[PDB]
Ligand binder design. Structure first.
Ligand SMILES: *[C@@H]1O[C@H](CO)[C@@H](O[C@@H]2O[C@H](CO)[C@@H](O[C@@H]3O[C@H](CO)[C@@H](O)[C@H](O)[C@@H]3O)[C@H](O)[C@H]2NC(C)=O)[C@H](O)[C@H]1NC(C)=O
Ligand SMILES: *[C@@H]1O[C@H](CO)[C@@H](O[C@@H]2O[C@H](CO)[C@@H](O[C@@H]3O[C@H](CO)[C@@H](O)[C@H](O)[C@@H]3O)[C@H](O)[C@H]2NC(C)=O)[C@H](O)[C@H]1NC(C)=O
Ligand SMILES: *[C@@H]1O[C@H](CO)[C@@H](O[C@@H]2O[C@H](CO)[C@@H](O)[C@H](O)[C@H]2NC(C)=O)[C@H](O)[C@H]1NC(C)=O
Ligand SMILES: *[C@@H]1O[C@H](CO)[C@@H](O[C@@H]2O[C@H](CO)[C@@H](O)[C@H](O)[C@H]2NC(C)=O)[C@H](O)[C@H]1NC(C)=O
Ligand SMILES: *[C@@H]1O[C@H](CO)[C@@H](O[C@@H]2O[C@H](CO)[C@@H](O)[C@H](O)[C@H]2NC(C)=O)[C@H](O)[C@H]1NC(C)=O
Ligand SMILES: *[C@@H]1O[C@H](CO)[C@@H](O[C@@H]2O[C@H](CO)[C@@H](O)[C@H](O)[C@H]2NC(C)=O)[C@H](O)[C@H]1NC(C)=O
Ligand SMILES: *[C@@H]1O[C@H](CO)[C@@H](O[C@@H]2O[C@H](CO)[C@@H](O)[C@H](O)[C@H]2NC(C)=O)[C@H](O)[C@H]1NC(C)=O
Ligand SMILES: *[C@@H]1O[C@H](CO)[C@@H](O[C@@H]2O[C@H](CO)[C@@H](O)[C@H](O)[C@H]2NC(C)=O)[C@H](O)[C@H]1NC(C)=O
Ligand SMILES: *[C@@H]1O[C@H](CO)[C@@H](O)[C@H](O)[C@H]1NC(C)=O
Ligand SMILES: *[C@@H]1O[C@H](CO)[C@@H](O)[C@H](O)[C@H]1NC(C)=O
Ligand SMILES: *[C@@H]1O[C@H](CO)[C@@H](O)[C@H](O)[C@H]1NC(C)=O
Ligand SMILES: *[C@@H]1O[C@H](CO)[C@@H](O)[C@H](O)[C@H]1NC(C)=O
Ligand SMILES: *[C@@H]1O[C@H](CO)[C@@H](O)[C@H](O)[C@H]1NC(C)=O
Ligand SMILES: *[C@@H]1O[C@H](CO)[C@@H](O)[C@H](O)[C@H]1NC(C)=O
Ligand SMILES: *[C@@H]1O[C@H](CO)[C@@H](O)[C@H](O)[C@H]1NC(C)=O
Ligand SMILES: *[C@@H]1O[C@H](CO)[C@@H](O)[C@H](O)[C@H]1NC(C)=O
Ligand SMILES: *[C@@H]1O[C@H](CO)[C@@H](O)[C@H](O)[C@H]1NC(C)=O
Ligand SMILES: *[C@@H]1O[C@H](CO)[C@@H](O)[C@H](O)[C@H]1NC(C)=O
Ligand SMILES: *[C@@H]1O[C@H](CO)[C@@H](O)[C@H](O)[C@H]1NC(C)=O
Lengths: 462, 131, 131, 52, 51
């Protein structure tokens, strides 16, 4: 009859909270050399298992833009980047006034590099010696009070920190697993129509998450996850102009980038064994520096973007214009392959429109027609604000290639008006947080509160 | 409430079912609670995970109970917190939304339970000294 | 099995004797479990030593026992694991080689004990609600 | 000679490298075993085994 | 010295430093309080001081 109070231990109640995660990796990545890659010296092996568990009913409200885990990844990657450059340091010259002349080669000349005569210290701090290396044009500035074309200075020395990366490390995006310590659990929303926030219902539980790839990337995102069935377009305000929109594609569109041969990497020693490498001569001829993209895949992929984007807009058109100027770090697409850095121009990708008149291009009469882009190669990398973004990259041995599986776009809508039925999208950059937010939106971590109280007819015997 | 058997999923395997349907399986469920400068965060997680467990254990140990699964007491339930039918809550609701209703009066209940425990222990001393 | 008295040697003081001859002294024996960048290893040892202790305590607490020394249960012994005489094992063998024979079926026994515990607690609730 | 590579650093004039004896203890939960068999020929069945 | 007179507790000290490039030295000046500068010399050389 009468009711008393009973306490239960083991009650499944979830609450929102902030915490940290566990870094782990597959076993084949721990038998390699130290800091090749950082995971080998940094993380702990784990099992990619168990089996994902789907819940009976439950209703949950995720939110892509309210998640600490994404910023946590940003802090971890920036922190480890700074820690990777502490035991590998250069402080020596490479800032002395550089006297330069038009770069020549055994078979002709080159316009994008300069051959610069040096003035360095020998291994003994008593003497200076003559030397030469070749550099890319955008990394050298003519520091002068007048038009003195024979006095140049290494761009990076305007501020500092000329340090050099180790010739025994690689930045291949080894996949990382995020596990949670005991007392917490990870929830994964499986609703493929999930439109950014609110009641998920296919909610599964996981003890440790899926792989993620720490790829540094700008406007076009390279290797990553795939969509389920069709194109997905995420956004925050839409109305507001200062926001970034995420486009997830069900393609992937093949893309390949490459460069020509170079002779080798001159090994120059400064003072007490501070070896560094520099781009030497080039044999034989000299070419670009370009990227290739299949046209017919690009065409229908970019059109399918239109048919799904028009879901939010009545009878208004989609247009594509170049990015809002600025220096190359803003307008040109930057990515890394094989230790080299390229900055490419994407004019031939985003020029056109869609007005609802969809035209499937058929048949596949000639698949040889492709799109080609120009690229540039830098060596001073200014990656992240506050990470010691001051790396001087070395060159590598010969001609290298890179093949990638492009999965998504980062776009922003222009702030046009005056009867703007031709709304245009610009390519826009942003923080690396936004890329990882696009990868990590499925996952959330909650606290377990195992104690609970409920009324009952039970009573303790005296 | 014990037909799963193969439990490596913790409390989360029973979520969404009725509170009556989860009265058992609490054994394996509870077990899941305990099973460079980077070492600092790796360590800190282990220590705070322990600190959370013991404080929850104190609450059970303070007001006199063992057999962590289910503990009944002698404090009468004050209907002013819910004024609802027992069977309606016990069979229709799962633990999820139940928490969101009783989470306001938890501190009141903890206080009464502590007072009750002291009353009983002293009562035992009088009945002990009789023999 | 208690004639030593002066025990500051832990479990290791009874090794080699028969399992029956070590049925006592488990009190002091158990007690021995708890009594620059270099600080990192010095600290890590203390935290993992605690983590080992509590998980062992959970196993006892999960399937319903206290009085850590000796815990008997109600699960019948399945002779298919040994098919050997009790007295032969209990008086001729010490704990050392005994472990090396039963260490294959430990997980089976843990499962059955957990199931048994749930059966008993529920049975109590029915008999409680009668009064 | 040393400058072929680097690191010419200098030891402090207030330190000494006298081999001070070190004790190795184990934290709780472990124990140390010592084999007292003076004829012990590198591996196998010790029988005078003490605990420390 | 100062635009309006002189001061006795500070000295104006001409410098000899390195530019941003480790190839050149440049001229500079700053003012310092008298008690933080010592005339490091073997004789009465009032034109050679050290921080
Ligand atoms: C994908 O392939 C299709 C094949 O239809 C392309 O269609 C062609 O697209 C161009 C560019 O949108 C069209 O020419 C343009 O016409 C508009 C006015 O309608 C004019 O304002 C532009 O200056 C330009 O002249 C062209 O008519 C249309 N058809 C063909 C066969 O060329 C489609 O454009 C390709 N992908 C893209 C980037 O749109
Ligand atoms: C160095 O440069 C040479 C020239 O770019 C690159 O060699 C070339 O590699 C590409 C990719 O393999 C070749 O295309 C393909 O070759 C494969 C070989 O099995 C064939 O299966 C493909 O369908 C296609 O033919 C290209 O023809 C090739 N040239 C030679 C001489 O083999 C090489 O990849 C570059 N990279 C390095 C590190 O060597
Ligand atoms: C870069 O400039 C240097 C400076 O002249 C060139 O080095 C000299 O090259 C000539 C002919 O190859 C030799 O006679 C000299 O002995 C070289 N100088 C030294 C110090 O070795 C170099 O050839 C130029 N390289 C390129 C690719 O332009
Ligand atoms: C040093 O840094 C200053 C800025 O901190 C740079 O000064 C500018 O130079 C760029 C072109 O290189 C101009 O567009 C800017 O207008 C100049 N001032 C500003 C505000 O940047 C200078 O180039 C850097 N390089 C040196 C001095 O070596
Ligand atoms: C995702 O779906 C939600 C609704 O489930 C959309 O929420 C809109 O929120 C604004 C806020 O004022 C309301 O005024 C709208 O009326 C909401 N939609 C509806 C139908 O009520 C949310 O915008 C969707 N997210 C996106 C960006 O697709
Ligand atoms: C610097 O190091 C190199 C080796 O790393 C030394 O070169 C050798 O010198 C020794 C005699 O000192 C010779 O036996 C070797 O045959 C030489 N080469 C090698 C392979 O060692 C050199 O002596 C060192 N000293 C300097 C350059 O100051
Ligand atoms: C220590 O004693 C052991 C035996 O207790 C020696 O073991 C030998 O191992 C090899 C391996 O093939 C056998 O073939 C020999 O027959 C073993 N000895 C005997 C008698 O069987 C071990 O070598 C001895 N260690 C040393 C190096 O003295
Ligand atoms: C400190 O001494 C310096 C060295 O003479 C003075 O600097 C010069 O000042 C005069 C007049 O103001 C200028 O004609 C020179 O061009 C200055 N030299 C430089 C390098 O700029 C400075 O005025 C003195 N300041 C004080 C406060 O005594
Ligand atoms: C969802 O709730 C219903 C209520 O009867 C329950 O039967 C069902 O088992 C729950 N979810 C699942 C798939 O068990
Ligand atoms: C460059 O280095 C050489 C080494 O001889 C040194 O003699 C010279 O003065 C420095 N600068 C010039 C003027 O070449
Ligand atoms: C929930 O997700 C799982 C993942 O395999 C899927 O198989 C299942 O179909 C989804 N739910 C439903 C309603 O089937
Ligand atoms: C993408 O995966 C490929 C395939 O191995 C690897 O080549 C490539 O490096 C990854 N892409 C990037 C961004 O490097
Ligand atoms: C951004 O979206 C919210 C929800 O639609 C809306 O209230 C707000 O008006 C939008 N931004 C502005 C400044 O209107
Ligand atoms: C982008 O904006 C510029 C501004 O002059 C305009 O001229 C251009 O046509 C725009 N769109 C295209 C198609 O480039
Ligand atoms: C980018 O490429 C287009 C095509 O070569 C060219 O018109 C333009 O000058 C390039 N530069 C930038 C940064 O726009
Ligand atoms: C843009 O697309 C048009 C299609 O004819 C092409 O002619 C032009 O080269 C592309 N680039 C520019 C400058 O628009
Ligand atoms: C690119 O997508 C194709 C689809 O089959 C897949 O087989 C291939 O592995 C992907 N390549 C990479 C490197 O992701
Ligand atoms: C075992 O070692 C101890 C050490 O003192 C020794 O005294 C004893 O004699 C050895 N064992 C035997 C068989 O005596
Ligand atoms: C002081 O610095 C200047 C910079 O020209 C240098 O020329 C001079 O020798 C250094 N010392 C003297 C003597 O001025």
């Amino acid at each position: 009859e009468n009711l008393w109070v009973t306490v239960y231990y083991g009650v499944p109640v979830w609450k929102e909270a902030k915490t940290t995660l566990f870094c782990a990796s597959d076993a084949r990545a721990y038998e390699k050399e130290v800091h090749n890659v950082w995971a080998t010296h940094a993380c702990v092996p784990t099992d990619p298992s168990p089996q994902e568990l789907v819940l009976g009913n439950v209703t949950e409200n995720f939110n892509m833009w309210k998640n600490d885990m994404v910023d946590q990844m940003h802090e971890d990657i920036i922190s480890l980047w700074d820690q990777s450059l502490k035991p590998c340091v250069k402080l020596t010259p490479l800032c002395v006034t550089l006297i330069c002349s038009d770069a020549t080669v055994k078979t002709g000349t080159v316009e994008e590099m300069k051959n610069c005569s040096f003035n360095t210290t020998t291994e003994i701090r008593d003497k200076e010696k003559k030397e030469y290396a070749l550099f890319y044009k955008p990394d050298i500035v003519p520091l002068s009070e007048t038009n003195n074309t024979s006095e140049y200075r290494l761009i990076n020395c305007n501020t500092s920190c000329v340090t050099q990366a180790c010739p025994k490390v690689t930045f291949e995006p080894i996949p990382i697993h995020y596990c949670a310590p005991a007392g917490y659990a990870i929830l994964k929303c499986n609703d493929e129509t999930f439109n950014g926030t609110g009641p998920c219902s296919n909610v599964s539980t996981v003890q440790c998450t899926h792989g993620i790839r720490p790829v540094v990337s700008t406007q076009l995102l390279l290797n990553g996850s795939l969509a389920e069935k069709e194109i997905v377009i995420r956004s925050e305000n839409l109305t507001n102009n200062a926001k970034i929109i995420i486009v997830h594609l069900h393609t992937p569109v093949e893309i390949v980038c490459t460069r020509p041969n170079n002779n080798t990497r001159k090994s120059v020693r400064i003072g007490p064994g501070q070896t560094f490498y520099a781009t030497g001569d080039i044999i034989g001829d000299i070419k670009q520096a370009h990227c290739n993209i299949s046209e017919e895949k690009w065409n229908d992929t970019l059109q399918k973007v239109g048919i799904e984007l028009q879901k939010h807009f009545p009878n208004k058109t989609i247009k594509y214009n170049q990015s809002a100027g600025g220096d190359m770090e803003i307008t040109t697409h930057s990515f890394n392959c094989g230790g080299e850095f390229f900055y490419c121009n994407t004019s031939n990708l985003f020029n056109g429109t869609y007005n609802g008149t969809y035209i499937s291009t058929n048949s596949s009469a000639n698949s040889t027609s492709t799109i080609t882009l120009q690229c540039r190669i830098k060596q001073i990398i200014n990656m992240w604000q506050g990470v010691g973004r001051c790396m001087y990259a070395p060159p590598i041995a010969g001609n290298i290639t890179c093949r990638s599986n492009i999965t998504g776009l980062l776009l922003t809508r222009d702030g046009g008006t005056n009867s703007n039925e031709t709304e245009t999208f610009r390519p826009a950059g942003g923080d690396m947080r936004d890329n990882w937010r696009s990868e990590l939106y499925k996952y959330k971590v909650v606290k377990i509160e195992p104690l609970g109280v409920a009324p009952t007819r039970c009573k303790r015997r005296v | 409430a014990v037909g799963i058997g193969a439990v490596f999923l913790g409390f989360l395997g029973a979520a969404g079912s009725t509170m009556g349907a989860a009265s058992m399986t609490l054994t394996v469920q509870a077990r899941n609670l305990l099973s460079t400068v980077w070492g600092i965060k790796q360590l800190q997680a282990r220590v705070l995970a322990v600190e959370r467990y013991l404080r929850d254990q104190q609450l059970l140990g303070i007001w006199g109970c063992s057999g962590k699964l289910i503990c009944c007491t002698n404090v009468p339930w004050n209907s002013s917190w819910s004024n609802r039918n027992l069977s309606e809550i016990w069979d229709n609701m799962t633990w999820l939304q139940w928490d969101k209703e009783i989470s306001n009066y938890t501190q009141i209940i903890y206080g009464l339970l502590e007072e009750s425990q002291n009353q009983q222990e002293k009562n035992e001393q009088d009945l002990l000294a009789l023999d």
